[PDB]
């Protein structure tokens, strides 16, 4: 017995306003922040793995790998300065998840992003699994110290082009991100082992589902749980050498192919939330402009 009456956005919206849809998990990646000015990996030329020649790395991926960072942290901090945004304005997609929170539907947002825009949009620590960590806080790397430093401190170090050193022990201070090759936080595994017991909808947005173990999250929901992908490209399908949008067996997965902001706007409109979402985004962006 399948829960969606049809494998379309309109079917997902009718399901969301049925009594059965009480707990929504969002799984999000870099595609929800490109319209906020943070580049993803997939975009041609503007992806973060391009335009790295100046750094003289052994291979492009080394800039985000923990072994290399440990020996040579300077390239990463130079890239961070180049990418640091003038303003942190969450996107329409971020504010759609704020609405899910406000309306009591959001069980959890699992994010691969480190850019802090979920928190700025008003998602609380309880609402979030920052699976790959965050720039919001940083720590001295010495095991016997671990002094914490805020983003305002780390930003000044990044822009002054001074490698951040701990004021207590002079060790390196590292943003609280999970580099490739580092263990994910315990919170990721503990939330993953509880949240998917009775989730009613997975909303997957702005990710290619190529980084593990985050990508395995789509497989943790019950087999009946609908899964909606809002993304520029179809993602999460089994490799011919997972999501089933198109087979004769397809029964619960829906792909809306386009910009995350436009997809969330379309879904909001079907739900009767379009004015609420427009008003929220305009008010939040105006407030961010005013506080500057």
């Amino acid at each position: 017995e399948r829960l969606l009456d049809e494998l379309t956005l309109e079917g997902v919206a009718r399901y969301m306003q049925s009594e059965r849809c009480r707990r929504v998990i969002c799984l999000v990646g870099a595609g929800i922040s490109t319209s906020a000015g943070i580049p993803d990996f997939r975009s041609p030329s503007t992806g973060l793995y391009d335009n790295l020649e100046k750094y003289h790395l052994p291979y492009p991926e080394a800039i985000f790998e923990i072994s290399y960072f440990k020996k040579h942290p300077e390239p990463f901090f130079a890239l961070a300065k180049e990418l640091y945004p003038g303003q942190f304005k969450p996107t329409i997609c971020h504010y759609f998840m704020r609405l899910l929170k406000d309306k009591g539907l959001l069980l959890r947002c699992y994010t691969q992003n480190i850019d802090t825009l979920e928190r700025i949009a008003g998602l609380e620590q309880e609402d979030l699994v920052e699976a790959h960590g965050t720039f919001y806080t940083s720590h001295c790397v010495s095991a016997s110290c671990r002094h914490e430093y805020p983003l305002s401190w780390m930003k000044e170090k990044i822009f002054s082009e001074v490698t951040p050193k701990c004021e207590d022990c002079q060790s390196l201070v590292k943003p609280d991100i999970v580099f490739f090759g580092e263990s994910l936080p315990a919170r990721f595994f503990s939330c993953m082992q509880s949240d998917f017991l009775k989730v009613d909808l997975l909303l997957v947005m702005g990710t290619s589902l190529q980084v593990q173990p985050f990508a395995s999250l789509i497989s943790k929901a019950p087999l009946s749980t609908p899964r909606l992908l809002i993304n520029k490209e179809k993602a999460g399908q089994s490799d011919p050498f997972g999501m089933d949008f198109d087979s004769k067996k397809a029964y619960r997965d829906v792909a809306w192919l386009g910009e995350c902001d436009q997809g969330c706007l379309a879904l909001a409109e079907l739900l009767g939330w379009k004015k609420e979402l427009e008003d929220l985004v305009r008010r939040e962006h105006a407030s961010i402009d005013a506080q500057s």
Binding site: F180, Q210, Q212
Partner: peptide
Amino acid sequence: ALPKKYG
């Protein structure tokens, strides 16, 4: 150690 981030 907990599972590591890999592409």
